[PDB]
C-alpha cells in the first residue's frame, strides 16, 4: 500500500497472509474453512496466516493453518487476469474472534464513489522499494466505469473495477495482491492488478467479487 496508513493490530480481522516460506500475497477470510484471494496468488505450498499484524514477529493472535486445496476460478486467464479470483480451503476451520472474522460477501454490487477500505503488507513505495512488517491500509473510492476504461484502454473487462484516486500518490502495490477491499462491511474486491503504483492516471484494478458470488457459495457447498 502507497500513501496508506498503518491499520493498527487486527483492527483488519478478516485481512489474512498466504505464506509458503515468506508472505507472498493477501487473502480474505470468508468463513471458518475458506479464504478468497487472485488466481495469479496460485501455488502450491500455502500456509495461510490469520490475526497477523507484523507479519515477521509471533505477537500472539496468529493462527497458522495449511491449505488442503485451492480452487482457481474455472475461467481465469493469466494474460487478461479476467475472472482472477481463487478459493483456498482451510486443513482444518479458524477458530473465529475479535481479531480473526470473516468478512461478508456482497449481495450487490458497489457503486462508483462508493468508499471502501483496501489494505496488505506490499510495498510502500512508488518508486523505490520498502516493505513493512505490520499491516497497511488505504481509504479509495470506487471509480467509474467510464474512468477506469479511459486509464487503461482495451483491458478492463465486466469482472474489474477501478479505485482509487486518478492524481495518483494513493494506490495498492506488489505484495498487497490477492488482498480485500472492502465497502460498507461488505468484500466487494481483490486486489488484482495495475500498471506501476500510485502513478497519474493509473489506479488500481480490482476483481469485481460480485460477480463471483454463485460461484463461491456453489464451490463451498460442494467442497
Ligand atoms: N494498484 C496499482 N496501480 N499497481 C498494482 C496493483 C496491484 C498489484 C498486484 O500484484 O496485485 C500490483 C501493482
Ligand atoms: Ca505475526
Known amino acids: 500500500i502507497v500513501g496508506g496508513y498503518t491499520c493498527g493490530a487486527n483492527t483488519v480481522p478478516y485481512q489474512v497472509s498466504l505464506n509458503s516460506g515468506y508472505h507472498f500475497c493477501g487473502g480474505s477470510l470468508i468463513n471458518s474453512q475458506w479464504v478468497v484471494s487472485a488466481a495469479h496468488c496460485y ?9 497477523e499484524d507484523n507479519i ?3 505477537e500472539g493472535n496468529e493462527q497458522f493453518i495449511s491449505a488442503s486445496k485451492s480452487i482457481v ?3 481465469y486467464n493469466s494474460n487478461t487476469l479476467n475472472n482472477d479470483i481463487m478459493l483456498i480451503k482451510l486443513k482444518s476451520a479458524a477458530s473465529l474472534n475479535s481479531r480473526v472474522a470473516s468478512i461478508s460477501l456482497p449481495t450487490s454490487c458497489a457503486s462508483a464513489g462508493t468508499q471502501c477500505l ?10 523505490g522499494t520498502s516493505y513493512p512488517d505490520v499491516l497497511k491500509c488505504l481509504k479509495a473510492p470506487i471509480l467509474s466505469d467510464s474512468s477506469c476504461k479511459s486509464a487503461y484502454p482495451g483491458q478492463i473487462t465486466s469482472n474489474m473495477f477501478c479505485a482509487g484516486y486518478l492524481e495518483g500518490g494513493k494506490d495498492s502495490c506488489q505484495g498487497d495482491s490477492g488482498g480485500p477491499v472492502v465497502c460498507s462491511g461488505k468484500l466487494q474486491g481483490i486486489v488484482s492488478w495495475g500498471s506501476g503504483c500510485a502513478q497519474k492516471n493509473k489506479p ?3 476483481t469485481k467479487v460480485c460477480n ?6 456453489q464451490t463451498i457447498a460442494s467442497n
Open 212 to 217: 463471483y458470488v454463485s460461484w463461491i457459495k
Open 43 to 51: 501455488k502450491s505450498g500455502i500456509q495461510v496466516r490469520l490475526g
Open 73 to 75: 476460478h474455472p475461467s
Open 204 to 206: 488500481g484494478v480490482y
Open 56 to 58: 515477521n514477529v509471533v
Open 118 to 127: 483496501i489494505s496488505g503488507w506490499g510495498n510502500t513505495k512508488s518508486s
